[PDB]
Amino acid sequence: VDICTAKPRDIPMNPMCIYRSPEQKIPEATNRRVWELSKANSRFATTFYQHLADSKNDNDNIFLSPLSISTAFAMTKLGACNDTLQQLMEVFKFDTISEKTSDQIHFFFAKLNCRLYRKANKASKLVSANRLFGDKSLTFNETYQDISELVYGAKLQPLDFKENAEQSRAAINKWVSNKTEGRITDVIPSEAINELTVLVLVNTIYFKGLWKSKFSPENTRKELFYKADGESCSASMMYQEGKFRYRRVAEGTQVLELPFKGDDITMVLILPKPEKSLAKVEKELTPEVLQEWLDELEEMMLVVHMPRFRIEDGFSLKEQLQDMGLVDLFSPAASALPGIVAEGRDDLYVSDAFHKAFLEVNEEGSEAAASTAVVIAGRSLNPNRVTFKANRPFLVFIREVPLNTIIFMGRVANPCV
Amino acid sequence: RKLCSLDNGDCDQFCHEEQNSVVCSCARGYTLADNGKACIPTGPYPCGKQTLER
Amino acid sequence: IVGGQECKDGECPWQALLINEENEGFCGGTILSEFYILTAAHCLYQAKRFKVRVGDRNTEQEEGGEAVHEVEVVIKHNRFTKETYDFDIAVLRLKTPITFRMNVAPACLPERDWAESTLMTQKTGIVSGFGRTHEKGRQSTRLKMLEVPYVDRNSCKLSSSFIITQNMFCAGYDTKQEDACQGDAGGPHVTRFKDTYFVTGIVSWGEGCARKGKYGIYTKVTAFLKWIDRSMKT
Ligand SMILES: CO[C@H]1O[C@H](COS(=O)(=O)O)[C@@H](O[C@@H]2O[C@@H](C(=O)O)[C@@H](O[C@H]3O[C@H](COS(=O)(=O)O)[C@@H](O[C@@H]4O[C@H](C(=O)O)[C@@H](O[C@H]5O[C@H](COS(=O)(=O)O)[C@@H](O)[C@H](O)[C@H]5NS(=O)(=O)O)[C@H](O)[C@H]4O)[C@H](OS(=O)(=O)O)[C@H]3NS(=O)(=O)O)[C@H](O)[C@H]2OS(=O)(=O)O)[C@H](O)[C@H]1NS(=O)(=O)O
Ligand SMILES: *[C@@H]1O[C@H](CO)[C@@H](O)[C@H](O)[C@H]1NC(C)=O
Ligand SMILES: *[C@@H]1O[C@H](CO)[C@@H](O)[C@H](O)[C@H]1NC(C)=O
Ligand SMILES: [Ca+2]
């Protein structure tokens, strides 16, 4: 059975413990709920990025899929109860959504991903590898396992953590590999899983878009990059002029949208003013202001200086999330996951969540329409040229056009090397 | 081939022929010399002159 | 420009540069004198708010010596068309006169007849600007200049896909691949006689930039010295 064309309540629905909390028009072909479960992620994405930002060095590149990190903990929200769930509800902002959704949610999140899966791969490539992991001994629910299969993709994979732990760890990794066909690997580090690691969250993504309008390699050359630590750098700097959508907000930060093939997936970049420190932008980042950056965009003839870069991120989500209010989900002494087991003695929790994202960005892209123009080629330039030479600290965003989902979030700090 | 045809009438700039005979003139900012076949500037930075101060 | 080189201090003082409110060049000029600038017509067509910067040889780094003047009066040749690129020229009167200095001085304007017989017959001239450097490459940071053999009118025509007005003229190397390119329009094309340079044509159009058997098209100044100084009297 395929979820991308199979409404809920067409499969065992309405699970155990369902949480309850004490004019904007819907786009073209779209389900009111998806667009909902979607905007929720958006709400969640900014907060999270922020925290995860302090966890690292202003000089380390950043990358990730809020939507993944989001959808995963949705497979937990699925089988959670009491004071534990509430949290998972208010930290992933799933408390805004309506009744139904806030229940079958785990399903929609799927129905969402699919949509975002096609358009993406249709012209470009998006690989994902994510599963939930638990020890043998524990006898996991039969149902959840059924749900988890036809919703998150696969069931839960029991491993011998207690037995030969590491033997199991490095067994997960390999799995990621045989799925992301190489690209992502070592999702989980060393000294992450020991003889207590009962349950771990694992979501990982790879993405390499395709420019709607390529970049000539022949116009790529080593130039300088002015790091935030003050330092200098030499990276591969690409370059091309064309009409793109763009906006210089009042503040002055610069918003550039570069579409991938088909204009279904664009990757806007946020390049602040040199006066401004990419951090302040990050310190002051809100969902409300993510809006301003896009809400008003104009198509202009702007020259784009963008670097060629790669970014592979691996990190424990637990550290962060915790600080954000999710506590119980990770404390054995006080959990509430009677949905995936309900038998032990309050013996089920999450030891860690491993998110591994990887982004590629070379000149590549294409449509190659044709030499569709054979007229007098005036030798003057566009009087209204505007330039975007992102040869310094800039944010990254990868979204869906109609739905406006923030697929990928990220930051380019150190390109060169 | 005759007047201005031959070595541009030994002038320094423009060549003509008022009264079946060679005549010279100069671009604005210049002043023909008393010898009549050479253009002597009128100021410091005159047209066509690559700025060279050293 | 495509090929050529880089005007060393004071080799192309007349080069001017039109720039926008966001500050960006996009059309060469030709200092005709302390007030009037000589540029292309198509340059201002879809333009909007600009200014002329003089004697600046580097855009990535401003270091004085460079001056920014404002435009008091724009005058496009009333008979210009983006459909024939004929009459692609225009004169610019600034609001506050230029102050000549190194890297900054005019270029002389020939006298019709003499011109057509002494500069136009000459073998080469020098176009310059901050254009690209391949049909669709990068903009130049610095001010390149390049020499260009005049081309046989009757030949120009056989190579041209588009007609060639007697207002135009060709300049390119039969096989060498160097030329003027986008960002260069409106720039100077000066021809030397003795120790003086005269402006001869304006950087207009062309098919691509340095294509096989394709030539550089320049507005024949020598055929406007009239409409010019006429304009030079508003
Ligand atoms: C307490 O009240 C709350 O719960 C009750 C009961 O919930 S329960 O079912 O869990 O018990 C809710 O009532 C129930 O929900 C109804 C509902 O969702 O409207 C209804 O759901 C069924 O019927 C829906 C309407 O169908 S339709 O024929 O009128 O279209 C259907 O919703 C439609 O889904 C499709 C879809 O998902 O494909 C939507 O298509 C739209 O998007 C598609 C692309 O999606 S994508 O993901 O973005 O890619 C496009 O291809 C398509 O073009 C586009 N339509 S378009 O016009 O824009 O082009 C379509 O818009 C939706 O209307 C339900 O599918 S579902 O996926 O949305 O769930 C379907 N589910 S089903 O039950 O399995 O069949 C239930 O019948 C109804 O039960 S009830 O007993 O009758 O009440 C109640 O709404 C809820 N109140 S609330 O929570 O506060 O809001
Ligand atoms: C969990 O759920 C209910 C609240 O609905 C609570 O009364 C109960 O004590 C909690 N703990 C359990 C599972 O006994
Ligand atoms: C992935 O694993 C399967 C089953 O173990 C194996 O058949 C396949 O060869 C692996 N991937 C490849 C193509 O190497
Ligand atoms: Ca400069």
UniProtKB/Swiss-Prot annotation, chain A:
Found in plasma. Changing residue 52 to P: In AT3D; type-I. Phosphorylated by FAM20C in the extracellular medium. Changing residue 270 to N: In AT3D; type-II; Haslar/Whitechapel. GO terms for biological process: blood coagulation; regulation of blood coagulation. Changing residue 392 to M: In AT3D; uncertain significance; type-II; Kyoto. Keywords: Blood coagulation, Disease variant, Disulfide bond, Glycoprotein, Hemostasis, Heparin-binding, Phosphoprotein, Protease inhibitor, Secreted, Serine protease inhibitor, Signal, Thrombophilia. Belongs to the serpin family. This is Antithrombin-III. It comes from Homo sapiens.
Curated annotation (Swiss-Prot), chain B:
Residues 1-40 form the EGF-like domain. The gene is F10. The lineage of its organism: Eukaryota, Metazoa, Chordata, Craniata, Vertebrata. Coiled coil: none annotated. This is Factor X light chain. Disulfide bonds join 4-15, 11-24, 26-39.
Swiss-Prot record, chain C:
Changing residue 156 to F: In FA10D; Padua 4. The active site is at 42 (charge relay system), 88 (charge relay system), 185 (charge relay system). Residues 1-233 form the Peptidase S1 domain. Changing residue 124 to M: In FA10D; Roma. Changing residue 186 to R: In FA10D; Padua 3. Disulfide bonds join 7-12, 27-43, 156-170, 181-209. Changing residue 24 to Q: Reduces activity for cleavage of PAR-2/F2RL1. No significant effects on factor Va (F5) binding and activity toward prothrombin in the prothrombinase complex (F10-F5). It comes from the Eukaryota. Changing residue 55 to R: In FA10D; may affect splicing. Changing residue 116 to A: No significant effects on activity for cleavage of PAR-2/F2RL1. Changing residue 76 to A: No significant effects on activity for cleavage of PAR-2/F2RL1. Changing residue 140 to P: In FA10D; Marseille; decreased cleavage by factor IXa; normal catalytic efficiency for prothrombin. Changing residue 132 to A: Reduces activity for cleavage of PAR-2/F2RL1. This is Activated factor Xa heavy chain. It comes from Homo sapiens (Human). The gene is F10. The chain holds residues 235 to 468 of 488 of the full protein.
